[PDB]
Design a protein around this nucleic acid. Structure first.
Lengths: 146, 165, 60, 214
RNA sequence: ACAGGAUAACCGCUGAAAGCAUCUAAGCGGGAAACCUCUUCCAAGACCAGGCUUCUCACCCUCUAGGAGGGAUAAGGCCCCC
RNA sequence: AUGGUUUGGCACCUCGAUGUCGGCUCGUCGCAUCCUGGGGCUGGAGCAGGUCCCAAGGGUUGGGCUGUUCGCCCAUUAAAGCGGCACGCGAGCUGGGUUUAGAACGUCGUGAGACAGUUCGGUCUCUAUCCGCCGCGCGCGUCAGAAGCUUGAGGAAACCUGUC
RNA sequence: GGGGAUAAGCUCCGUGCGUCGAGAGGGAAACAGCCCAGAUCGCCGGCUAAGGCCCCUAAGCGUGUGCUAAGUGGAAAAGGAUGUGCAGUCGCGAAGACAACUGGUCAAGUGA
């Protein structure tokens, strides 16, 4: 029959993506693909055999058009008139990592397995991270030519 | 565009430093720094000027060419001799003088009015009715002159207040 | 698709090249090779690349 | 910057000012406070000073609290609370073991007293939220104190959260701002504060320099 | 409340395309009880479940020693009691 | 051209039940802004208005008459806004009106009777299962077991105005 | 085609018109009546239809030539409007064109 991963089959690696001057959607899609494990031939939608992804320089990320001051991030508290909106500009200047986190999280499945996969994403607004002990592998967003 | 194509002469006495697009000029009046838009580069013409070279003819570039040229011209003419604004009052009972580095007006309000001098400008008051401000940048001089002009609402009836020459 | 992109080729071009080369392994055993015998999958990728046209976008 | 002290609400009384007007004053035992710890940004991320107040027998303290007090270098006190400052410049005037007394304030100053409001138990909407009751006659049937309507009919379909209904009342931290200090009796460590301060007699309060009128 | 930030209508400064002009397409300023802070309160079940400290910091038995299970304790807590 | 805030048209929805108006109690939202805030032009001299923009934070009275909404009036006020939400809200209240059975007037009918004509009188049931919401606990978790003091992501409240 | 205000998710007729009724499967987010296609059963085989190929989500951040600045794409009219690409005309013009400062300076395009 088709191969199925067992208890100790999944092996995880660490990647770091430098978000400097990278389109938000492009980086978010690449990071979602890495987190889901779609790049591994042993992929199984049942299992979270993905990899740990580190994103540094989250505040340097590139947003095209006028989406910096015309795209809103919304949230409702649950109380009447509890709708709050911030543009990408102030959201970046206050919580730089939140833009990248929101974008990536919106691109992976909304099941419980997606909640588990979220745990393997670390984003940092600075150029450095505290995960040097894991020796992350630098990652470049390339496109396979056809 | 047509203005943009014309190189702006650089006097021999002003030291012009070009680092990519960041341009700095050290004139006798002082030093002022300008940044050039990316599509149009600036290279110091060896014959005593600089080159405003617009390589493309797309609308953005053809519109920014003349803007960059006239901005550079304003910069150089402001760093060699500076810029000066001449002001005055019309009416009666309005007195103006300079209190050290700060300006104090008496337009007739229940309170004295103070005007703060930012960097790069100085206040000249030779008479209560007429006074002047000078600076090395045209933009700050214009902005502060407008601010000082705003001290009275416009009078289309009698004309009390202040006006440019 | 994962194993093909690991060999610098897309799934669709790989399927087209395998069909052109005449190999008749179905997707079940292709995935089996991809998981169990990566060397065999790389060899099949090589033959598929060989069988592909020189300009895939040509009006051929 | 902003001063502060821990104290006890003693009760309310009456005094007359120099213009013969009467002043209702709450008496606060701004007892001696000892600085037990200093919060610094380099260590805790925020600047604050921690004060201790009250007297307790050393056999009533548990081992962890006694250890903290011993590490600080002072004998234990009943109450411990933190005063949040603004920056290390405001934190430099306190050191561990320093004693704070009522004279840090002056006559005529403005203060903010913080205490725990008196408990009211389970209270109805008329008491908890000032709802007007329904009629006491003219046919009203057993609705003399009930809230009445709760929501819409179809488009709401539910009850909005934050809707005001009956429940527990009181026992919450309350701050009264811009209270005037009528007199600072330094002998008894007593502050005469004009007005009413939260809580019951014998309750613990924090007196701080006013944030608006200071 | 005061104060600060970014803005609305609006008032402007420096000026191109369009040799002038143009508060504008490059930019820079002012500008409201609206918005963000600021005032008060809740808030780490904030699952990224945080921080600063302090206290205890140990003792057996069983199966087969792989883990587990059981017992007795410390710091501390609860019940009973006022 | 918008809207379904007016009367409409259709009858898809229910006749093995979807309470019909006002009022009270309690809301929430929009802005097409009544006051307060900021401006522009004045056929604006100042005052004061006209008029037009931006602005929804808060506020927006008490009575006489009528079942009323509506309306008119009386005193004020900074102002006495317009609307959505089963023309919000009867397992929250009323029962004055409408809408059973009694009786009477006018009118119609030979008559029994009738009248989107009037008049007087006339049972408003229920111990909350679930969601929702307001409060209060128990259990487990937060990689040993505890204890003090806390940062705050994130939320909630408050925001009125006059005279001198 | 009639009635209605050619308004209705209004109503009434004609149609070797369709589908549903009595029709599963795929697509249109969900979606009796729209599009593809008519399920005898099994298969951990292959090719396609409609519709698709950045991630959710299977397959192209496909190739080549152009356009768009409006997040248009990703709802709407009368009408208003120095946006821009392409093409076609004409007027004026090195005897010096337009602007700027009938005659002078100036210097290529300048007007509908």
């Amino acid at each position: 029959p088709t191969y199925t991963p067992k208890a100790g089959d999944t092996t995880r690696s660490w990647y770091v993506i430098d978000a400097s001057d990278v389109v938000l959607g492009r980086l978010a899609s690449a990071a979602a693909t890495l987190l889901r494990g779609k790049h591994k031939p042993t992929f199984t939608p049942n299992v979270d055999g993905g990899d740990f992804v580190i994103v540094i320089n989250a505040d340097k990320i590139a947003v095209s058009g006028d989406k910096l001051t015309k795209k809103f991030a919304y949230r409702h508290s649950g109380y009447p008139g509890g709708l709050r909106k911030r543009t990408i500009g102030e959201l970046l200047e206050k919580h730089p990592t939140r833009v990248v986190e929101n974008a990536i999280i919106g691109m992976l499945p909304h099941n419980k397995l997606g909640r588990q996969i979220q745990k393997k994403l670390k984003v940092y607004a600075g150029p450095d991270h505290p995960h040097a002990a894991q020796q992350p592998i630098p990652f470049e967003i390339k496109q396979v030519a056809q | 565009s047509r203005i943009g194509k014309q190189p702006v002469p650089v006097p021999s006495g002003v030291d012009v430093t070009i680092n990519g697009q960041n341009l700095s000029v050290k004139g006798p009046k002082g030093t002022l720094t300008l940044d050039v838009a990316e599509p149009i580069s600036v290279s110091r013409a060896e014959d005593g000027a600089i080159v405003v070279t617009r390589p493309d003819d797309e609308r953005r570039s053809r519109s920014l060419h003349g803007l960059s040229r006239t901005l550079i011209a304003n910069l150089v003419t402001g760093v060699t001799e500076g810029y000066t604004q001449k002001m005055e009052i019309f009416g009666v009972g309005y007195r103006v003088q300079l209190k050290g580095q700060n300006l104090e007006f008496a337009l007739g309000y229940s309170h004295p009015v103070l005007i703060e001098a930012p960097e790069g400008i100085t206040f000249a008051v030779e008479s209560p009715t007429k006074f002047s401000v000078s600076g090395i940048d045209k933009q700050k001089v214009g902005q502060i002159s407008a601010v000082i002009r705003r001290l009275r609402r416009p009078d289309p009836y009698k004309g009390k207040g202040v006006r440019y020459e | 698709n994962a194993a093909a992109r690991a060999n610098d080729i897309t799934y669709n071009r790989l399927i087209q090249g395998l069909k052109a080369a005449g190999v008749e392994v179905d997707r079940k055993n292709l995935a089996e090779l991809a998981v169990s015998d990566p060397a065999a999958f790389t060899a099949l990728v090589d033959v598929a690349r060989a069988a592909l046209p020189e300009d895939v976008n040509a009006p051929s | 910057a902003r001063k502060g002290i821990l104290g006890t609400k003693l009760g309310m009384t009456q005094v007359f000012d120099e213009n013969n007007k009467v002043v209702p004053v709450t008496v606060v035992k701004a007892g001696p406070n000892v600085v037990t710890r200093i919060r610094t940004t380099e260590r805790d991320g925020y600047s604050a000073v921690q004060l201790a107040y009250g007297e307790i027998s050393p056999r009533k303290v548990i081992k962890p609290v006694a250890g903290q007090f011993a590490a600080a270098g002072v004998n234990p006190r009943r109450h411990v609370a933190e005063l949040r400052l603004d920056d290390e410049a405001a934190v430099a005037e306190y050191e561990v073991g320093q004693e704070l007394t009522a004279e840090i304030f002056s006559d005529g100053a403005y203060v903010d007293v913080t205490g725990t409001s008196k408990g009211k138990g389970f209270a109805g909407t008329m008491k908890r939220h000032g709802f007007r009751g329904q009629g006491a006659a003219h046919g009203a049937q057993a609705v003399h104190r009930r809230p009445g309507s709760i929501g819409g009919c179809a488009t709401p379909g539910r009850v909005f959260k934050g809707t005001r209904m009956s429940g527990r009342m009181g026992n919450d931290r309350v701050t009264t701002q811009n209270l005037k200090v009528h007199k600072v009796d330094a002998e008894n460590g007593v502050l005469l504060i004009k007005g009413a301060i939260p809580g019951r007699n014998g309750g613990l309060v924090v007196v701080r320099s006013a944030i608006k009128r200071g």
